[PDB]
Design a protein around this ligand. Structure first.
Ligand code: ATP
Ligand code: ATP
Lengths: 549, 551
């Protein structure tokens, strides 16, 4: 429905191409019809009258007609391939561009394969256009014209043919829903297999280290077996459809001939009148059979399009929050949490009522226990997820009224899962903005003390890095990631071990001498202040310090 | 290449099914030939004789023979489907089970999209099996028989028909190689695109954080445009091939009719001979053209079967060493790194001549600046990469002699990265051996101080964890990994930053290992300074300066 409107909008710029395809199709059909008159004239005129030069002229003419037919087919086929390629590219690009903008909980709740599997299933829309456009354009008009011609030719035999077509229609609508169910099932099974296979290949180090190759092999064999069962149950459905349609066609033809012979035996028609009708049936039954044979392709394309559209209907990140203010550009200092409450989906609320303030341009630290909301605060400050019953204010302006691009550009976050893409270091070290000069990159790298190891690399800053940065070590990857973050020139820098920096450290030894320290326990700030104040108050910080040290 | 042998080996257990397919298809063709006489028998011999009961009997008979035709088609098709699934499943399973055994040099070189793209391009072989087998088996025999019938019928035009076959042969030979080139190019471009897609997702955190949703879009658009260019070249090549074949076929039919007409005009064979020849021509040219129409499809099946081949020929991990299990089943300490130099693929030598000993028990620690190669030593003890020159002795016997399975089952190594498989906490905790009682898992989780958060989770040890363990935090993931390693009951335990059994601790901060037994300092891939904490600090060496810098 909506997706069909989308395809209509995609086809609208290609009206000239579609019209050219249609005109070439009409010329090809007309030449194909005129082709058989070669034999028809040859064995009625040329042979009986013993003409030689006339025979040569006629043979050359029919060869010329056939050559024009082939050229028209060639031109039409090129145009149809162009149309299919354009539509497929547009679908893939739109889907991918929308996926990259989805909210984060979508990515956290969906397997990798099931996000790209649908992408790879956009080829079935391309495989449906190329294999059905010509048929839909020519055989519809061919069938209508054939119906008119049979109606003016005979009455009773035309009604028998109409019963054949009605039976065709009854067959098609019965096998409509089950084919969709089979297609959806096989698509879901392929998605699950792809997801599990990607997940197994990526983390091969753990499998090899624990020697769990047998378990992974058995699980993938189970998933392949499920794929086979679904594909078998779909293939039986297709073969049932094909056999039943074939029986209808063959028995319809035989009954047509039987009725014609019976009528010829009595006085109803003449043998020539039956032969002409039988010859003319080749322009009516065959087109409808050709339209109905397309059913698997169009059904698969419709299911694939619905599966793609199940994602496109989702709301992107920017579509969730409204308004942009745009008056604020200088996000700096005085970060405020105002009665913030957060809860990941339906789990217990990990982040209860908290009210914490951060002074302008000061180095503050967060200390808690494993399971508290430290990284949750870090991700919440950069608006990956929105809170429930609170506001986050920066310099008196709410986080909800600041454009996403400003937040992403102006706040840097250095997590523990460093990701390094495939490509040269210059690309990895400059990901956000593809405009910086080498002086800034070198300054940022020297600031993070990443200049040594990057010098030691073969092609200085132009060395190639394998996927997931396996070409480097863990420390080198962490240093390169912190250099990339520092290159951003941020105003709010979060580190997860006049620019405000928040350090999230699990070791209390490095927390000392960091201005203000926030003790986050049970999803609430139990205590806050400088290190000396927490030591003097003999709070939970004192016990934590005594236990760790 | 040599994949045909393995294909034949797969086919060998299915000889009965293949024979049944052949017999059913042959009966289908014979019934089709017999039933194609209905119109001629009706018009020529039935209606002109005014027979009505005979009409009814013959029409019923031809309906019956058609229904038999449909039953044979149903049986043949279901057998072909079963054959296709069987071979396809066998091929994919063999490929995957081989990939899981390749050495780590293969995984750090390729991408995580090339391997999966090669796996998923094995459905082309199933498409070929489902599409071409029937046409081949019937139409080869049909073409041979049609040729014999044409030769016995008239020898004047059979030579023109042979000329047509020769033109098909030349066209196929000319278009053989460019089709393979185009197929290989499109498969390689799809592999690149799929790898880019997989890398962009699971990594979306960094893209969103750095605001790179447009640059990634641009790169993926360029890759899709390259795929479309290769696809267009392949499509144009296919259309050129099909147009040449169509021209040859149509012009050959017209030329045969022209030659027959010219023959009939002169004092030669009568028109009835020409009609018989034209009727027989549908039994020779139409089948042989059907084989030629299988040229593209079959080629796309061959190239895929070649791609899988160049993964299977790679030497596995178990095949690059000799087994000397004998009686050693215990890695009980006394580790010795004799003179060993290890280089990675081609970069530089990162480990120079190394000589060290680790006692039977005790807790030992290795320190050194980034790039020294501590993780390299840890990976060497697991035999992920074999040393270029030298040997590593576990207890009097080198690792090369000890079986791989025993090494992987007795040494635990917790790394900086933690991988959590999608599933349940119980399944992730029990990854090595599937059959573990609940008591052992609970004890291991308690030892790693990870039972508390598991218990606080909903459904205790069920807590279905999403991909990459996104359901849990990072500290919980580290605790889970340590618990999983401890469940292994290891003889050697290697501990990274993630925090009578020999313990090797790779420590980044010098203050966490001051009370250990021995400390090894890696400088320029060497252990120039070694000993306990007291000796190094008193020596006023590089360790002393490192300690002062830390303090
Ligand atoms: N896959 C690889 N291919 C090539 N060189 C590599 C590869 N992995 C690491 N190296 C390099 O070889 C050395 C191995 O370092 P290793 O991984 O042992 O880290 P490290 O010295 O413990 O440092 P850190 O713990 O700070 O990451 C480093 O110089 C690193 O740059
Ligand atoms: N994607 C998620 N879905 C559901 N719950 C989650 C998700 N990510 C984290 N949690 C839960 O949210 C809580 C807070 O986790 P968080 O990352 O803030 O902890 P932390 O204190 O930073 O961790 P660490 O132990 O690594 O220092 C934990 O109970 C964790 O299990």
């Amino acid at each position: 429905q909506n997706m069909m409107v989308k395809f209509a909008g995609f086809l609208k710029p290609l009206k000239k191409t579609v019209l050219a395809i249609f005109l070439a199709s009409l010329l090809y059909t007309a030449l194909g019809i005129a082709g058989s008159f070669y034999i028809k004239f040859l064995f009625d005129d040329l042979i009986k009258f013993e003409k030689l030069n006339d025979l040569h002229i006629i043979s050359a003419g029919f060869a010329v007609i056939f050559l024009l037919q082939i050229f028209l087919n060639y031109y039409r086929s090129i145009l149809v391939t162009k149309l299919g390629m354009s539509i497929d590219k547009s679908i893939m690009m739109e889907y991918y561009s929308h996926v990259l903008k989805l909210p984060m909980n979508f990515f956290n709740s969906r397997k990798v394969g099931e996000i790209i599997s649908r992408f790879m299933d956009a080829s079935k829309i391309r495989q449906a256009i190329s294999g059905a456009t010509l048929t839909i354009m020519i055989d519809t008009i061919m069938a209508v014209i054939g119906g008119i011609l049979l109606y003016i030719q005979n009455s009773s035999l035309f009604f028998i043919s109409f019963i054949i077509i009605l039976l065709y229609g009854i067959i098609v609508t019965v096998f409509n829903k089950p084919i969709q169910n089979a297609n959806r099932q096989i698509m879901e099974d392929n998605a699950k297999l792809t997801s599990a296979l990607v997940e197994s290949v990526k983390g091969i180090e753990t499998i090899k280290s624990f020697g769990a190759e047998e378990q992974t092999e058995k699980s993938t064999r189970d998933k392949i077996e499920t794929v086979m069962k679904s594909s078998f149950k779909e293939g039986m459905l297709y073969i049932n459809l094909s056999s039943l349609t074939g029986i209808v066609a063959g028995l319809g033809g035989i009954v047509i001939l039987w009725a014609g012979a019976y009528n010829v035996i009595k006085g109803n028609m003449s043998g020539g009148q039956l032969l002409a009708f039988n010859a003319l049936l080749a322009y009516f039954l065959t087109p409808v059979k050709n339209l109905i044979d397309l059913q698997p392709l169009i059904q698969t394309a419709v299911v694939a399009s619905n599966r793609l559209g199940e994602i496109l209907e989702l709301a992107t990140e920017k579509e969730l929050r409204e308004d942009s203010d745009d008056f604020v550009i200088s996000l700096k200092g005085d970060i405020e949490f105002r009665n913030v409450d957060f809860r990941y989906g339906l789990r217990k609320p990990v982040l209860k009522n908290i009210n914490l303030t951060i002074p302008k341009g000061k180095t503050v630290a967060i200390v808690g226990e494993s399971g508290s909301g430290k990284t949750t605060l870090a991700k919440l400050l950069m608006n990956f997820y929105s809170p429930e019953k609170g506001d986050i204010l920066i310099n008196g302006h709410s986080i909800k009224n600041i454009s996403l691009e400003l937040i992403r550009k102006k706040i840097a976050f250095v997590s523990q899962d460093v990701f390094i893409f495939s490509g040269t270091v210059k690309e990895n070290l400059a990901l956000g903005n593809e405009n910086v000069d080498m002086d800034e990159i070198i300054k940022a790298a020297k600031m993070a003390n990443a200049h040594d190891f990057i010098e030691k690399l073969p092609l200085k800053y132009d060395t190639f890095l394998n996927e997931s940065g396996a070409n480097l070590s863990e420390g080198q990857k962490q240093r390169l990631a912190i250099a990339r973050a520092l290159l951003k020139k941020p105003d709010i820098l979060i580190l997860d071990e006049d620019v405000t920096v928040i350090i999230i450290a699990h070791r209390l030894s490095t927390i000392v001498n960091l201005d203000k320290i926030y003790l986050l326990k049970d999803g609430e700030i139990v205590e806050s202040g400088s290190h000396t104040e927490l030591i003097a108050l003999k709070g939970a910080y004192f016990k934590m310090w005594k236990q760790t040290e």
